[PDB]
Design a protein around this ligand. Sequence first.
Ligand code: MET
Ligand code: CO
Ligand code: CO
Ligand code: NA
Length: 262
Amino acid sequence: AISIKTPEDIEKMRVAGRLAAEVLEMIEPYVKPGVSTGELDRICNDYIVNEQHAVSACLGYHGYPKSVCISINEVVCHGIPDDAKLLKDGDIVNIDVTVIKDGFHGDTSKMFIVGKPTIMGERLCRITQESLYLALRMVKPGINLREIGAAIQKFVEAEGFSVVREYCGHGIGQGFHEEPQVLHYDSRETNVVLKPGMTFTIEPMVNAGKKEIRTMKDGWTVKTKDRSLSAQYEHTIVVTDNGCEILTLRKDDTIPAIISHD
Ligand code: MET
Ligand SMILES: [Co+2]
Ligand SMILES: [Co+2]
Ligand code: NA
């Protein structure tokens, strides 16, 4: 059941993708020491609803109570925004946004460094983004997803970090999480050949320490087992005839929006 988007579908995804990217571009100036994650969530929500006239796909999903996911430091993913959680100098934080517009989803995330960065945090964020970019450069019709997961893993590991196994990229479109599962590591279980019109996300979570993770009692928050820092970046893409197009590209991305192979 891997859905192939029509040209019309892709046009709608381009819109939803840009909206999502825009939320991330917009929030930047607000990310400073002393701000709470609860406030960031409110600002995002307002923008999405009142300015963009869109909807957050997260709010209510399986009961998720907020509009975006904000994961600080050792929180891997799904961090829940809260008025009591204040950002400090040196924190690294991921803001993951998924917007729905005209029934199509746009899913993307990036890391932000609060105030003065630490050596580890900067490095970790950089390597994580680079691992995503590497993956994007490989995307093209005919290739097996497995190769992509394997490349990410090799890269990350060579740099002294680890890749989280449990969470993965996913198809996306009218549905939030569609087939297929996009693994960020090498697995003999993976056997999917890419074809034009497929749309999915790549969103590697990398840990400064060991790969092990743990789910909190809240049922959402995921943290590293060894409390090391964790970083993630995400983009939604569409496979094209000779490469791919990045639907959630932002002003700060340093990769071209269209990647062509020849
Ligand atoms: C708690 S919903 C998490 C969704 C997230 N935006 C993803 O990439 O799947
Ligand atoms: Co996401
Ligand atoms: Co995603
Ligand atoms: Na984090």
